[PDB]
Amino acid sequence: EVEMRLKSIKNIEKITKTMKIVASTRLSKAEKAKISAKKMDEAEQLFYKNAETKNLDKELIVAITSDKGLCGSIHSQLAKAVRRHLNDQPNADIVTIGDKIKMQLLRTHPNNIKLSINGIGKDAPTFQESALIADKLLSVMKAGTYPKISIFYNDPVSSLSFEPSEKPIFNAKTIEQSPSFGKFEIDTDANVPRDLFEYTLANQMLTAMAQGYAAEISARRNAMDNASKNAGDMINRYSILYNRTRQAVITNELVDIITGA
Amino acid sequence: SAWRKAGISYAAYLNVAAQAIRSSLKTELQTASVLNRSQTDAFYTQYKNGTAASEPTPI
Amino acid sequence: TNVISITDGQIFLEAELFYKGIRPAINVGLSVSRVGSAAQVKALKQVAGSLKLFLAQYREVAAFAQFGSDLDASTKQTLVRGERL
Amino acid sequence: SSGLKLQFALPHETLYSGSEVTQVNLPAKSGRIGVLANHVPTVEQLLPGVVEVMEGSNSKKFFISGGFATVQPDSQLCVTAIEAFPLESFSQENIKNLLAEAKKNVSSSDAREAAEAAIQVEVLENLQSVLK
Amino acid sequence: AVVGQEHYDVASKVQETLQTYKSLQDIIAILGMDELSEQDKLTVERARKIQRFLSQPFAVAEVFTGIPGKLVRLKDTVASFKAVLEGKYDNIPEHAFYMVGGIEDVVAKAEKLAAEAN
Amino acid sequence: AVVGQEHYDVASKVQETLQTYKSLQDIIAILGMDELSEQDKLTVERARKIQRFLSQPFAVAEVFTGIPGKLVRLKDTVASFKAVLEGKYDNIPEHAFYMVGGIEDVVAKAEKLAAEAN
């Protein structure tokens, strides 16, 4: 049964290599998106720094996960934050994004998930797909009326130094009357506050989804990488056992044949 | 333009503008990600209190 | 070894198959028959010509489903076809 | 910092990042935003027009179909547009005349669909207008 | 036709599940329980519970396990296993499935673990 | 200098394309037949037909298969595989060059089979 173990580990290693190639293919696009998305969000963040855009105070619960079903700690860490939010704010509506986050959000509170959209992590973060997702969110159940909304989003530092970290969003009320919003002026006719809330949600969502897709592609290159290491170690051990077993079998055969003679 | 009355949101308007502006261009400008910008496979099925994901209509 | 070198072939009923519930337990991939369908009623042959290839494909997707993850349309269809067969 | 910095980083592909300029005149929602230098703390949602970003060199003209240009107190114009455009690829004739009219077929849809597509009704005219 | 069609099916399902666990053990160790299917994960969890249900307290083995021995009734055991595969106690504790009698003693052990472990 | 200058040129590609076809054997089944580039998808559409075209019915395997046998020559097969690589018949169907004779014999296989579709 050692031979079947070695060959099955070898097959798992081949499958892991194929998954690594798929990870590279998806990670190229995820990084390509995140590169521009980070700057896009920093553009409106400059305003949120130009005007201290602290939001005070029906409050949604969100998470970051692409269209894959967990990779090491890609879905688990976000699920823990989702359960913590469910405990803290049971009456908090959930935005079920992708599949793994969709399944995790459907797990805790049936009355929280207000949307169930799948396959968000199809490819790189696209501006139009993210924008349409937000516009639907900005139209579903008055998520703009949601006084506060925390984005429990991945913060991949370099490779996997992340969890679904929580951040605030400057909404329609919190944009116009920010304490340092006196710095940047708005127009009564232009209706700045609503548009600033929507666009802040847009930039934050695009940047966060791009970072999360990049981080899960990392989980497809930093969790399967650990699995590839495990397969290498198991394969070396099994190869040692089989090479020793074959040699010992041949030796015992020679010994038996001579001992017969 | 008519985002004020009966659209979806500011993102919907600017995204439709993006789709038209890309349509106001040939292949020598529109990169591959513009295809996913046009081919959006995000399937929106708003759930419910009783976990009623009605229909995953493309976003 | 000598029998498998002299016999017609084998139905190498591996223990995993019989443990996997498939009773009888002809491990189709590990099976072999030198004679083959030429020594068969063609009524069987018309369906076996596809049955063998379907089992072969299922052998090609066994590892992919062993990973327990998604894939393209051909792969998932092959897995469902092989398990059903 | 002297001059005026622009942050034109759209959700598609970031174009400008804090580069100095002499003018970034753009078509705001309430009007024409001709912020040349420094500007003042005020950020406006934008209307489809031309952003002739006058750098220290010539003013590149790109008919941009939307955005918001945050005039940060550091003479930083954070123009988080939705689309990018060249000074040459954003200039064409046939692509700006038939596409909108073919889209007018979509306007034959129901009420909410027409309300959405009313933006596209005049979307392509702006590029052919600002192409010069 | 020996011990019952239901018994034969129960044994067949149990063996299939355990064989699935052994077959997936390689990928489980190499990658982890999360990396595979939720159907596969569910089967693996049920199989682990079943394997942990395989042991029992034997009357003279009380020297080792320390529990007074338990003799599981054949029909009761078959029903218990059919239930456990069918998820009539799939939420009971794993450590409360080892060294007990039938699924009744399993539930009693789960309650005891609810009292002590908490 | 021992097998023919062209025969090594084509085989080098033929070995590489099949190895690339072997290299593309894993990737195509993972995410689909899309990831290939224009040269790669050409190879996937040149080799997976050539690897299928690798087959040939035998002049002695008459009793089982039923397809009359094929016996092209070296000057036939060598330039045959190159034209398959060269794409001069890249429009041939999936089974067009498979289980066939030479390159000139891969033309009729699709042509006679295309009669059923029209």
Swiss-Prot record, chain B:
GO MF terms held by the record: proton-transporting ATP synthase activity, rotational mechanism
Compartment list: Mitochondrion; Mitochondrion inner membrane
Swiss-Prot/TrEMBL GO biological process terms: proton motive force-driven ATP synthesis; proton motive force-driven mitochondrial ATP synthesis
Residues modified to Phosphothreonine: 51
Any Pfam family: ATP-synt_Eps
Keyword terms of this UniProt record: ATP synthesis, CF(1), Hydrogen ion transport, Ion transport, Membrane, Mitochondrion, Mitochondrion inner membrane, Phosphoprotein, Transport
GO CC, alphabetical: mitochondrial inner membrane; mitochondrion; proton-transporting ATP synthase complex
Family matches, as InterPro entries: ATP_synth_F1_esu_mt, ATP_synth_F1_esu_sf_mt
Family: Belongs to the eukaryotic ATPase epsilon family.
Subunit structure, as described in the record: F-type ATPases have 2 components, CF(1) - the catalytic core - and CF(0) - the membrane proton channel. CF(1) has five subunits: alpha(3), beta(3), gamma(1), delta(1), epsilon(1). CF(0) has three main subunits: a, b and c.
Task performed by this protein: Mitochondrial membrane ATP synthase (F(1)F(0) ATP synthase or Complex V) produces ATP from ADP in the presence of a proton gradient across the membrane which is generated by electron transport complexes of the respiratory chain. F-type ATPases consist of two structural domains, F(1) - containing the extramembraneous catalytic core, and F(0) - containing the membrane proton channel, linked together by a central stalk and a peripheral stalk. During catalysis, ATP synthesis in the catalytic domain of F(1) is coupled via a rotary mechanism of the central stalk subunits to proton translocation.
Extra remark beyond the main annotation: Present with 4280 molecules/cell in log phase SD medium.
Name assigned to this protein: ATP synthase subunit epsilon, mitochondrial
Organism for this UniProt entry: Saccharomyces cerevisiae (strain ATCC 204508 / S288c) (Baker's yeast)
Gene that produces this protein: ATP15
UniProtKB/Swiss-Prot annotation, chain D:
Keyword Heme: no
Protein localization: Mitochondrion; Mitochondrion inner membrane
Domain of life of the native organism: Eukaryota
Molecular function GO labels: proton-transporting ATP synthase activity, rotational mechanism
Range of residues in the leader sequence: none
Chief localisation class: mitochondrion
One BP term from GO: proton motive force-driven ATP synthesis
The keyword Ion transport belongs to this UniProt entry's keyword annotation: yes
Gene Ontology cellular-component terms listed: mitochondrial inner membrane; mitochondrion; proton-transporting ATP synthase complex
Key words, A-Z: ATP synthesis, CF(1), Hydrogen ion transport, Ion transport, Membrane, Mitochondrion, Mitochondrion inner membrane, Transit peptide, Transport
Subunit structure and binding partners: F-type ATPases have 2 components, CF(1) - the catalytic core - and CF(0) - the membrane proton channel. CF(1) has five subunits: alpha(3), beta(3), gamma(1), delta(1), epsilon(1). CF(0) has three main subunits: a, b and c.
Role according to the record: Mitochondrial membrane ATP synthase (F(1)F(0) ATP synthase or Complex V) produces ATP from ADP in the presence of a proton gradient across the membrane which is generated by electron transport complexes of the respiratory chain. F-type ATPases consist of two structural domains, F(1) - containing the extramembraneous catalytic core, and F(0) - containing the membrane proton channel, linked together by a central stalk and a peripheral stalk. During catalysis, ATP turnover in the catalytic domain of F(1) is coupled via a rotary mechanism of the central stalk subunits to proton translocation.
Similarity section: Belongs to the ATPase epsilon chain family.
Record protein name field: ATP synthase subunit delta, mitochondrial
Protein source organism: Saccharomyces cerevisiae (strain ATCC 204508 / S288c) (Baker's yeast)
